[PDB]
Design a protein around this ligand. Structure first.
Ligand SMILES: [Ca+2]
Lengths: 193, 557
């Protein structure tokens, strides 16, 4: 069947999802993630959207403001709205899968609720496609692809000019923060390109 | 993050071998999540950070893929021109343009709420403003508006069956990331993926540009321009966040450089060493590189030359002889807390002293603090990520190369003194410092080993577990957060593919309300520490053969 989602766990607990369509396949994935890593995922959602002070307090206000100032939520929603129904299924399947398991947990918290929700004094909320997208945006795009020190570099350069004069300040800048160095060991050999 | 890919011509008893060690820090519960997907055109196995829809590490029985951080320059800052009167406007192409703005309310558990505004221009969100210059800085990313497409390219690539299909997806991944390929036929490939700006002529990407119009990027460079190799003449592909290719410019970070001193050399040495490598040998490179001091190789010749005319009773000469006798591989003593040889401690003190006398001296305060680290700095929990050669150390290496270095020495870092005299002065400092703490008998120096901590707070500094959930490993290992190996066409099996991984502490982070910990909460922790690994299953018969449980759902959209 098309309604059927089979979940097989191996000797390490690693889940394997058997499904006939995209929505059912990502629903299965979403479901096991909510089973295995709900507190982690929940904290990862608040970290990537800047909503930690709500449950954790005063100490995270600066963190929350810094996260919100580094993105444009509306630009992310517009990319979601432009997806094709097959692409959209991935994200919707996933959020739906998670929600299915959050509903049972929230229904039977005396045995299903992750101990840390009790510790931290809050409970899990339902997910939407925007939330799934933000997990990737916040930890892959801002973690590994958002690197610059240009304002700082300018500050440094200004101090080198005040020390060695204008032309000298600039040549020292090139010695400390060169653009390229032809002796750098490379992944692609020079014969290749 | 490191990776080594071995093709047909370098592989022994297989056609292709892929070993990946993504480095993101050590966390409890695991940074990555193990998952197999079978249906709707997908047939994959692997693990991926934060259980993203697409698997960063894994294979589909035909091809295998992996990643390492790219570090290309894909972000530039635009100095926006504001008017004192007419606020919330900026000058662009001779018109006063209005900024996008949004208000935000930060709700605070047990405190008052807080609201602020976020501003945005054509170039990007505003970082900071200088109302004295009447300048606002906007951070411009080449991948702005392709975030979602990058996620989907990472998902769709799992279905590729060849290089041709695989690169159609690589062309849509817009973040600066290295992608790797291997297949059942022994083919291997590499792509430095990402969206890079087509800059205006005379744009120096290390420094801000005016955002008034003339400095605006021309667009984005085509994918034909992205560094890539297929079936390289060497038989292998190695990366440890080094330069992709000759003359490729790195990130603008002051602290990031691609120079003659690079930790990828440590991988290359080992892969060129043996004409062919087996899977156990390819796996074994993790153990060696985990334990290798990264500075020994770079400055041993320099220290040797400087102490060559010194006497045997000279302590500065003794210290160099200790290092000469050493292979650079750190091993713990029986005590689980100290290293067998004092090499790293010596290089650490020497290097700190050397930096203070050379690079630090040439830079004005407080910019001098950016170049003073030796790269051994840690705490009680050990390093937060990988060990690397510090920026100051890469700059000092070029200086000690003298004229063999391609980098013009605008200021002589040795400030008119012969090299040997600065080296010997730093060696005197070293001896004075270390002998004071450990005594005069170098042979009984028991130096402190670095440790490994699986942190309860995620990389943002936000709790993702209870503090008590923190795990400790005695030996610091400069390796992936996870390690995975894929072997295509083993001669050793009937199986066309074999794959292994390790996801520590375990698959599950579940703790029941009563304090009852899941069965898979920490069953991979000891495996991690002793360089072990678990089989990854793809086919139904393997999965069936190894099943521990089954759950069937009947759901309709
Ligand atoms: Ca830049």
């Amino acid at each position: 069947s098309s309604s059927e989602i089979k979940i097989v766990r191996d000797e390490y607990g690693m889940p394997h999802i058997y499904a006939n369509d995209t929505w059912h396949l990502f629903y299965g994935y979403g479901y096991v993630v909510a089973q295995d890593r709900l507190f982690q995922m929940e904290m990862a959602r608040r970290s990537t959207q800047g909503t930690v002070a709500e449950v954790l307090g005063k100490d995270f206000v600066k963190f929350d403001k810094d996260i919100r100032r580094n993105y444009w939520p509306d630009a992310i929603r517009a990319q979601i709205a432009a997806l094709s129904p097959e692409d959209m299924s991935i994200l919707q399947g996933y959020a739906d899968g998670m929600n299915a398991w959050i509903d049972k947990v929230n229904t039977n918290p005396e045995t299903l609720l992750p101990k840390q929700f009790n510790t931290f004094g809050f409970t899990p909320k339902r997910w939407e496609p925007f939330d799934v997208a933000m997990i990737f945006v916040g930890t892959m795009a801002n973690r590994f692809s958002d690197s610059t020190s240009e304002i700082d570099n300018l500050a440094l350069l200004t101090a080198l000019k005040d020390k060695y004069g204008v032309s000298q300040g600039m040549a020292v800048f090139n010695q400390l923060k060169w653009l390229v160095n032809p002796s750098a060991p490379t992944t692609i050999a020079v014969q290749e390109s | 993050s490191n990776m080594w890919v071995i093709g047909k011509s370098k592989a022994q008893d297989a056609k292709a071998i892929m070993v990946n060690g993504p480095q993101f820090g050590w966390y409890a519960p695991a940074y990555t999540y193990g998952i197999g997907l079978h249906g709707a055109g997908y047939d994959v196995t692997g693990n991926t950070p934060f259980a993203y829809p697409g698997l960063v590490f894994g294979h589909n029985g035909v091809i295998s893929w992996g990643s390492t951080a790219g570090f290309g320059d894909d972000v530039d800052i635009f100095a926006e021109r504001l008017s004192a009167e007419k606020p919330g406007y900026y000058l662009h192409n001779g018109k006063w343009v209005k900024m996008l703005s949004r208000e935000e309310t930060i709700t605070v558990k047990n405190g008052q709420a807080e609201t602020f505004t976020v501003w945005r221009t054509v170039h990007g969100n505003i970082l900071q403003t200088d109302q004295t210059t009447q300048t606002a800085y906007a951070k411009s990313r080449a991948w702005d508006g392709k975030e979602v497409a990058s996620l989907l390219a990472w998902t769709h690539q799992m279905k590729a069956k060849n290089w041709q299909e695989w690169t159609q997806q690589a062309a849509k991944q817009a973040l600066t990331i290295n992608w790797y390929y291997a297949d059942v036929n022994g083919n291997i490939g590499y792509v430095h993926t990402g969206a890079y700006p087509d800059r205006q002529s005379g744009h120096d990407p290390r420094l801000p540009v005016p955002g008034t119009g003339k400095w605006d990027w021309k667009g984005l460079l085509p994918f034909e321009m992205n560094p890539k190799v297929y079936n390289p003449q060497s038989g292998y592909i190695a990366n440890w966040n080094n330069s992709p290719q000759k003359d490729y410019p790195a990130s603008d970070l002051f602290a990031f450089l691609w120079g003659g001193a690079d930790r990828v050399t440590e991988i290359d040495r080992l892969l060129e060493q043996k004409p062919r490598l087996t899977a156990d040998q390819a796996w074994d490179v993790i153990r060696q590189t985990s334990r290798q001091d990264l500075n020994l190789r770079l400055f041993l010749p320099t220290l040797q030359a400087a102490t060559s005319g010194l006497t045997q009773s000279d302590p500065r000469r003794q210290l160099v002889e200790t290092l000469t006798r050493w292979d650079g591989i750190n091993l713990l003593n029986d005590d689980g807390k100290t290293w067998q040889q004092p090499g790293s401690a010596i290089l650490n003190v020497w290097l700190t002293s050397m930096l203070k006398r050379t690079v630090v001296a040439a830079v004005p305060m407080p910019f001098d603090k950016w170049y003073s680290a030796s790269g051994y700095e840690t705490t009680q929990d050990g390093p937060t990520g990988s060990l690397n050669i510090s920026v100051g150390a890469k700059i000092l290496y070029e200086a000690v190369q003298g004229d063999k270095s391609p980098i013009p020495q605008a200021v002589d870092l040795f400030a008119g003194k012969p090299q040997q005299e600065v080296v010997l002065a730093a060696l005197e400092d070293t001896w004075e410092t270390l002998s004071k703490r450990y005594g005069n008998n170098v042979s009984n120096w028991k130096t402190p080993a670095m440790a490994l901590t699986f942190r309860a707070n995620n990389f943002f500094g936000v709790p993702q577990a209870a503090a008590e959930e923190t795990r400790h490993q005695a030996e610091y290992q400069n390796r992936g957060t996870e390690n995975d190996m894929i072997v295509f066409s083993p001669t050793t099996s009937d199986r066309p593919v074999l794959a292994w991984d390790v996801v520590a502490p375990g698959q599950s982070g579940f703790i029941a309300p009563d304090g009852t910990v899941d069965k898979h909460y920490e069953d991979q922790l000891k495996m991690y520490e002793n360089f072990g690994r678990k089989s990854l299953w793809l086919t139904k018969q393997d999965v069936e053969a190894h099943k521990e449980s089954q759950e069937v759902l009947h759901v309709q959209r």
